[PDB]
Amino acid sequence: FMAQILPIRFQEHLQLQNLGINPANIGFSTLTMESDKFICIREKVGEQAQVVIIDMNDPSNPIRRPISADSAIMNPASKVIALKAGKTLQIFNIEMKSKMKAHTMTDDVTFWKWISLNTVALVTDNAVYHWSMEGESQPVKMFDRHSSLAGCQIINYRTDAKQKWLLLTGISAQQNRVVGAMQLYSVDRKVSQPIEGHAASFAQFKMEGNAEESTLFCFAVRGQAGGKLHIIEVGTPPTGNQPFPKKAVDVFFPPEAQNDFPVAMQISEKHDVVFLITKYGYIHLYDLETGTCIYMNRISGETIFVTAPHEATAGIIGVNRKGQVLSVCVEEENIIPYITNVLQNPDLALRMAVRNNL
Ligand SMILES: Nc1ccc(CN2C(=O)c3cccc4cc(S(=O)(=O)[O-])cc(c34)C2=O)cc1
């Protein structure tokens, strides 16, 4: 019943191999997508190291520049790029063809990522720094890394909106398992919490009855106890709010997917939906308020190794290993019909409609 409609809209936006990208460079170490505005790829043509920038507003005309850099990350909002070559970091203004800032670290930066329109996060072996692209300021140490992450491949770093709750995520191979290790740091309390987790995100959510938004932390894991998803409030609740009751639900893997696990998460605050992507290319949607599982399907034949929020649709956009750029968002006309008649969850249908009416 109602097989003709889904609660989502799947889209393919590009195929990177048709834009002259070599498939060997379509991967985590060489292809970055810091937001839905740009894809940046490092490639070596002959002996010449190049950066290719694909503007997602005009993708058919990608720009190549010779640049020697071990990593290249575009700003989420503006035509600004950060480049690193060993311990030396530079940020450039593309439009004005000019250096903005530079810094030389004393420790190697194993992982970095833009966390806002103006700030880069730097992860060394022993600490995490935030670096403004503005003014003269050097990077500022935010916290020391927790021992639980020693030896991990760092795969993500993100923060809540107010940059008071900071989350570093790595993974390690423990025999034939991929074990997630997160470090949640409170800026205000100066406290770290180690957490076994594979993918996470923050979100603001205004509870019925509350005048102020709650800051939520959502993470997913597949550990020895199976797949789990948790949704918890972090930090002091605004004065006058009731606290958000913590949610803990299962994350389903079919029997043929014993080695699948979560790899990416983005949240729609417009729809209060969590998007989780798995290693095997499955997407799951969960209600942010309750953790109820709305939808699961395999949407990609290849692993999706990078994701961002998809702004215009409040969805999730990603790149897979073959170079498909794909996205998933709420289908706003069909989601409530699906919840009503396929999930048979009228409580959720009502909550969604109450929010939509505003
Ligand atoms: N297509 C494109 C890409 C990057 C830029 C920004 N940009 C620049 O605009 C730029 C201007 C002048 C010298 C530069 C040197 C270097 S590097 O030698 O340190 O890798 C990098 C840059 C640069 C640089 O990235 C402008 C246009």
Swiss-Prot record:
For this UniProt record, give its keywords in alphabetical order, as a comma-separated list.
Acetylation, Autophagy, Cell cycle, Cell division, Coated pit, Cytoplasm, Cytoplasmic vesicle, Cytoskeleton, Disease variant, Intellectual disability, Membrane, Mitosis, Phosphoprotein, Repeat
| Biological function | Clathrin is the major protein of the polyhedral coat of coated pits and vesicles. Two different adapter protein complexes link the clathrin lattice either to the plasma membrane or to the trans-Golgi network. Acts as a component of the TACC3/ch-TOG/clathrin complex proposed to contribute to stabilization of kinetochore fibers of the mitotic spindle by acting as inter-microtubule bridge. The TACC3/ch-TOG/clathrin complex is required for the maintenance of kinetochore fiber tension. Plays a role in early autophagosome formation.
- In terms of domain of life, where is this protein from? Eukaryota
**UniProt feature coiled coil, ranges:** none
One of the entry's Gene Ontology molecular-function terms is:
protein kinase binding
- What is the name of this protein? Clathrin heavy chain 1
What disease is recorded for this protein?
Intellectual developmental disorder, autosomal dominant 56: A form of intellectual disability, a disorder characterized by significantly below average general intellectual functioning associated with impairments in adaptive behavior and manifested during the developmental period.
Gene Ontology CC = centriolar satellite; clathrin coat; clathrin coat of coated pit; clathrin coat of trans-Golgi network vesicle; clathrin complex; clathrin-coated endocytic vesicle; clathrin-coated endocytic vesicle membrane; clathrin-coated vesicle
The region called WD40-like repeat 4 is annotated at 151-196
Give the location in the cell.
Answer: Cytoplasmic vesicle membrane; Membrane, Coated pit; Melanosome; Cytoplasm, Cytoskeleton, Spindle
Region annotation WD40-like repeat 2: where it falls in the sequence: 69-108
Q: Where is this region: WD40-like repeat 1?
A: 25-68
Report the residues modified as Phosphothreonine: T106
* Record text about domains: The N-terminal seven-bladed beta-propeller is formed by WD40-like repeats, and projects inward from the polyhedral outer clathrin coat. It constitutes a major protein-protein interaction node.
Q: Does the keyword Iron apply?
A: no
Q: Which gene encodes it?
A: CLTC
Stated consequence of mutating T88A: Disrupts spindle localization
Give residues where Phosphoserine occurs: S68
Residues covered by region (WD40-like repeat 3): 109-150
Q: Where is this region: WD40-like repeat 6?
A: 259-302
